Amino acid sequence: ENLYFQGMRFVVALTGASGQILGIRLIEKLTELGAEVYAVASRAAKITLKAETDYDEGYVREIATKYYDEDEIAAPFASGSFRHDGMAVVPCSIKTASSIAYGIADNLIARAADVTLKEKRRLVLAIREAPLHSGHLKTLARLAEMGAVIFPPVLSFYTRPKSVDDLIEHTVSRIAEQLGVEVDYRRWG
Template sequence: MTAIRRLVVGISGASGVILGVRLLDILRGIGVESHLVMSRSAEVTLAHETDLKVQEVRARAAVQYPVTDIGAAISSGSFRTLGMIVAPCSIRTMSEIATGVTSSLLTRAADVTLKERRPLVLMVRETPLHLGHLRTMTQLAEMGAILYPPVPAFYAKPRGIDDLVDHALGRALDLFGLEAGVVRRWGETDQ
């Protein structure tokens, strides 16, 4: 049996849509098949934060699904993947996943990832956090999700936003055992 090199990518409506866009490029570059689902809010955020069109982002994925397609391959546990990453992850998306009351393919795919005991990485983009957010995060951690806010690592001496984005994504991909070559690692020689 060959190893599956397939990752589900969710892009929700939180600020930081560039995280999901860049992730698609990185995955293509390392030969990982990306399966993309974007929320409607992500499409709005994309227009506010970039000059990209929705179709341009979808074209970066190996496979893309409409957010309403609840019968898509990624909605089934029998569809094998390495797991799922939601980059960025809004508080609404995080909350839906935590309750299991999913209203879209994005949150359904995340729910399936958890039930199949595959890694689910949520790059939550919101601050400050109130107690309800923290309790939801605790609930998700107890369920097996990995909460990964894209906090900058300044020891890597980033030269700009691209370096910050790449470092955060490279570290998130480490959680799937994927080396992207975009991280300046502490204690290791420069790349």
């Protein structure tokens, strides 16, 4: 659609929080619109996928432009000299959000996110946990100060959703807008 003309490419990482379908649908949306997606899924994300979905273990690799596991710490986007247009961690665990906040860049996901931030590229973190305690909130404040977009994947009813897929589509569209993507979807305005 409107992402191949400028030839966009995004990093999308899935981590071990509930909501694997959100990252899968975001990858599907971005590639449909003509962007390249470099995808990574952590070991805990693969465990969560099995726990809460019926997706095949290879589906993310199949729909991505290029696929990396989390120990591929020499992947191209582990260096700031590799150009890309934004990274999303969807869904984002506390563990990965915190690893990014504090620089515990011990796998490809945290390192790629740190590289995204240091180069002042867009980073969107769909951080799923509730409640959030004071330590979580201090971590999210630090991430916001570092430039990350903090996007709790909250329930939203103002678009009159009728199915689970309706909720997923709204949240995925909203996350895509944080990457600079001008997605078409049902807005309040």
